[PDB]
Amino acid sequence: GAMAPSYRVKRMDIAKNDEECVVNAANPRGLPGDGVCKAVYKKWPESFKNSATPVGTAKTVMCGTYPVIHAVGPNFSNYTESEGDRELAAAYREVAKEVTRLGVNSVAIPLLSTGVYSGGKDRLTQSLNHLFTAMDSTDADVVIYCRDKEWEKKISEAIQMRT
Ligand SMILES: [Cl-]
Ligand SMILES: [Cl-]
Ligand SMILES: [Cl-]
Q: Where's the Macro domain?
């Protein structure tokens, strides 16, 4: 575990992270995809061997000794608000189990279902609160990755609010 487990946020490409493992915002079929998933495919393509997994689950595949945790959030274009919320919470719970099992001291994580799976809605708060619910009981250093300057400020404020 980390000496003083923390949350941090950075605005940059998660493929350039400084953590001991990465969470991919994956599709259920293990395809290269777009956005975070395509950057993850270009950096760790070996990790997409048998990475397909259902919605609300996470599947870890090694790239050398570097773990890639493929976490599949719901696409809110297809799910109801109610069922999507349940699947989004579940995907983060499975990420917490994988991070624990791997024994890593740090993890890079994107906000699941906030991009092309958002169904056109701002889900910063919804996705971040499910991230916290899952990861609060883990002792890894968590570094959240985002691309938007306004999202960086709101995520940083939410972390600081809990002190
Ligand atoms: Cl960057
Ligand atoms: Cl997404
Ligand atoms: Cl973002």
A: 4-163
Domain that holds residue 97: 1-163
Q: Binding site annotation covers 115?
A: yes
How was this structure determined? It was done by: X-ray
Residues with Cβ within 5 Å of ion ligand 2?
Answer: 115, 117
Query: With 0-12 CB in 10 A as exposed, 13-18 as middle and 19+ as buried, what is 49?
Result: exposed
Q: Does 116 count as an annotated binding residue?
A: yes
In this structure, the number of other CB atoms found within 10 A of the CB of residue 162 comes to: 8
Do the annotations mark residue 117 as ligand-binding? yes
| 30 annotated as belonging to a binding site for a ligand | no
Closest listed ligand to the CA of 144: 3
Query: CA–CA separation, 132 vs 7, rounded Å?
Result: 9
Provide the domain count of the chain.
Answer: 1
142 closest CA partner among 102, 94, 97, 110 = 110
